[PDB]
Amino acid sequence: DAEFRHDSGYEVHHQKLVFFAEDVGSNKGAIIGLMVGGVV
Amino acid sequence: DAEFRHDSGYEVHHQKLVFFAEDVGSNKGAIIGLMVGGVV
Amino acid sequence: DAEFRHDSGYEVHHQKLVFFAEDVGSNKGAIIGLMVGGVV
Amino acid sequence: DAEFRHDSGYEVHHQKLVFFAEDVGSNKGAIIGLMVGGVV
Amino acid sequence: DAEFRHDSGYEVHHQKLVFFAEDVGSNKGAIIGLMVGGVV
């Protein structure tokens, strides 16, 4: 009789992200709405 | 009689992402709506 | 009698992504709606 | 009597992607709606 | 009596993709709706 419902719009049981950014350069211009882990 | 429902719009049991970015260059211009792990 | 339903719009049990980007170049211009792991 | 239904619009049990991009060049212009792992 | 249904619009039990891109060239212009692993 029991009902179990799980709804996840997004689920990760495990997520790993690794990002490396190195930038040398002059006069970059940017507009970013959301930034994670980034070099402009 | 029991009902189990799992709905996931997106599910990853495991996700791994590795990104490396190196940029040398002058005068880049960008508009980015979302940025993750990036060099403009 | 039991019913189990799993619906995933997208599921990866395992996903691995590796990206390497190096860019030398001058005066790039871009508009990107979503950016992951990228060099403009 | 039991019913099991799995529906996945997209499923990968395992996915591996490796991308390497190196670009030398001057004055590239791009509009990209989604970018992953890329050099403009 | 039991019914099992699996429906996947796309399923890969295993997928491997490797891409290498190197580009030397000047003044490329592109519009890309989706980009993965690419050099403009």
UniProtKB/TrEMBL annotation, chains A, B, C, D, E:
The superkingdom listed in its UniProt entry is Eukaryota
Q: Where in the cell is it found?
A: Cell membrane; Cell projection, Growth cone; Cell surface; Cytoplasmic vesicle
What is this protein's function per UniProt? Functions as a cell surface receptor and performs physiological functions on the surface of neurons relevant to neurite growth, neuronal adhesion and axonogenesis.
Q: Provide the family line.
A: Belongs to the APP family.
This chain belongs to the protein called Amyloid-beta A4 protein
What is the organism of origin for this protein?
A: Homo sapiens (Human)
Q: Which residues of the full protein are shown?
A: 430 to 469 of 528
